[PDB]
């Protein structure tokens, strides 16, 4: 709704976990990864 102790208002692409800010979808996801640890790695591993 509103904020004060923050600068980045709104962005075209932000994280769903915390709410980070991004400009390109690809980027948004990249970070989103961090929000994952207890998971198996098959075709790709962090
Ligand atoms: Zn996040």
Coordinates of C-alpha atoms and ligand atoms in Angstrom, one line a residue:
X1 CA 0.0 0.0 0.0
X2 CA 2.6 2.6 1.1
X3 CA 6.1 2.9 2.4
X4 CA 8.6 5.4 3.9
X5 CA 11.9 3.8 4.8
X6 CA 12.5 2.8 1.2
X7 CA 13.3 4.4 -2.2
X8 CA 12.4 2.0 -5.1
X9 CA 8.7 2.5 -5.4
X10 CA 7.4 0.2 -8.1
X11 CA 9.0 -1.8 -10.9
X12 CA 7.9 -3.8 -14.0
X13 CA 9.4 -6.9 -12.4
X14 CA 10.0 -7.6 -8.8
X15 CA 10.6 -10.7 -6.6
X16 CA 7.5 -12.5 -5.1
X17 CA 9.4 -13.7 -2.0
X18 CA 10.8 -10.4 -0.7
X19 CA 10.0 -7.9 -3.3
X20 CA 13.3 -7.0 -4.9
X21 CA 13.4 -4.7 -7.9
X22 CA 14.3 -5.7 -11.5
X23 CA 13.9 -4.5 -15.1
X24 CA 14.1 -7.8 -17.0
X25 CA 12.1 -10.9 -16.2
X26 CA 15.3 -13.1 -16.6
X27 CA 16.9 -11.0 -13.9
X28 CA 14.0 -11.1 -11.5
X29 CA 14.2 -14.9 -11.6
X30 CA 17.9 -15.0 -11.2
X31 CA 17.5 -13.5 -7.7
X32 CA 14.4 -15.5 -6.9
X33 CA 16.6 -18.5 -7.0
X34 CA 18.3 -17.4 -3.7
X35 CA 14.9 -18.2 -2.2
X36 CA 15.5 -21.9 -2.6
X37 CA 17.8 -24.4 -0.8
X38 CA 16.0 -27.6 0.2
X39 CA 15.5 -28.9 -3.3
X40 CA 17.2 -31.5 -5.6
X41 CA 19.3 -30.5 -8.5
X42 CA 18.8 -32.4 -11.8
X43 CA 19.3 -30.6 -15.1
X44 CA 20.6 -27.6 -13.2
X45 CA 22.3 -27.0 -9.8
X46 CA 22.9 -23.7 -8.0
Ligands
LIG1 ZN1 13.5 -12.2 -3.2

